[PDB]
Each structure stands twice: as C-alpha cells, then as structure tokens.
Amino acid sequence: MIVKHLEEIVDTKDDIDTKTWNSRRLLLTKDGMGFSLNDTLIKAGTETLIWYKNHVEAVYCIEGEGEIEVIGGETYPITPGMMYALDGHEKHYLRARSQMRMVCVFNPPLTGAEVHDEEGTYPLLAPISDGSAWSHPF
Ligand SMILES: [Fe+3]
C-alpha cells in the first residue's frame, strides 16, 4: 500500500521547481509501480521544448489553458479535460497561457536524477518578472 497527499509533497524534495514548471512527484521509481506519476504546474506564460527519447508520457490537463505544438505535426489547444500522449516520442513545444495543472504518467518511471537533470526538457521562455533580482536581499 502507498498513500500520499499533494499537500505534503509541496515545498519538499519531491516538489521539483524549475523555471517553467513545478513538478510534484506522486509515484517515484522507488515506489515500484512500473510508471511514475506527477502533478505538474506549468507556469503561466512559459514555453518549453520537450523531447523524451527514452519514455512515453501521458499528460492530462485538469486546470488552465495553453497549447502543445508537435514539431513536424499539429498544434493542439490544451484546456481542462484535454489529454495527450507522446507514444511516438514526439518533439514538442508546451506553452502555458494561464498556469496549467497537468497529471503526468511516465513509462518507464522517471528517476530523481532525470527530473533534477531536466533531461528531455529545454526551457525557452520563463514567466514575466516579478521585479526581483538575485542581488536584492530586500
Ligand atoms: Fe509533455
């Protein structure tokens, strides 16, 4: 049996924060389910190029709006209830107009290494600036 809760996972080591996304890992390679499962927030206004050569991924949008553009393929608007699956290891752009909440399934599971290495992803456009600078302790 495995039981977890998103509200425990946030702001912990299984919550991986990147420029363009915040991935809350629900099932890890360690959990032995044969897939990994996460709840990923794609930050508003961002663009990320994605290419998983060594996994297939299912993505189920439960909040927000954006689009996925397949390289050499079509562009599919993302809205709540939209699902895409990269069974062809498609190279694609993932764009978030508003923040998107995505339930994602990877086969085989992603490893902690791969998530922290940001393997398979290339962040291209980060969220608009909130006026902060690294050199402003405040
Ligand atoms: Fe994707």
Numbering used by the authors: 1 to 138
From the paper:
By using an ectoine synthase from the thermo-tolerant bacterium P. lautus, we were able to obtain high-resolution crystal structures of the full-length EctC enzyme in complex with its iron-cofactor, its substrate, and its product. The (Pl)EctC protein is a head-to-tail dimer where backbone interactions between two ß-sheets mediate the contacts between the monomers in the dimer assembly.
Since the ectoine synthase is an iron dependent enzyme, we added Fe(II)Cl2 to the crystallization solution of the purified (Pl)EctC protein to a final concentration of 4 mM and pre-incubated this mixture for at least 30 minutes prior to crystallization trials. Since the monomers of the three (Pl)EctC crystal structures are nearly identical in overall shape, we only describe in the following section the overall structure for the high-resolution (1.6 Å) (Pl)EctC::Fe complex in detail. The structure of the (Pl)EctC protein consists of 11 β-strands (βI-βXI) and two α-helices (α-a and α-b). The data resulting from this analysis show that the (Pl)EctC dimer in the crystal is composed of two monomers arranged in a head-to-tail orientation; it is stabilized via strong interactions mediated by the N-terminus (sequence 1MIVKH5) from monomer A and β-strand βVIII from monomer B (sequence 81GMMYAL86). Clear electron density was visible in the 1.6 Å (Pl)EctC crystal structure for an atom with a strong electron density, which cannot be accounted for by a water molecule. Only when we refined the (Pl)EctC structure modeled with Fe2+, we observed neither negative nor positive differences in electron density, indicating that iron is indeed the most probable element present in the crystallized (Pl)EctC protein. Within the (Pl)EctC::Fe crystal structure, the iron atom is tetrahedrally ligated via interactions with the side chains of Glu-57, Tyr-84, and His-92. A water molecule completes the tetrahedral arrangement of the (Pl)EctC iron-binding site in the substrate-free (Pl)EctC::Fe crystal structure; it is present at a distance of 2.9 Å relative to that of the iron atom.
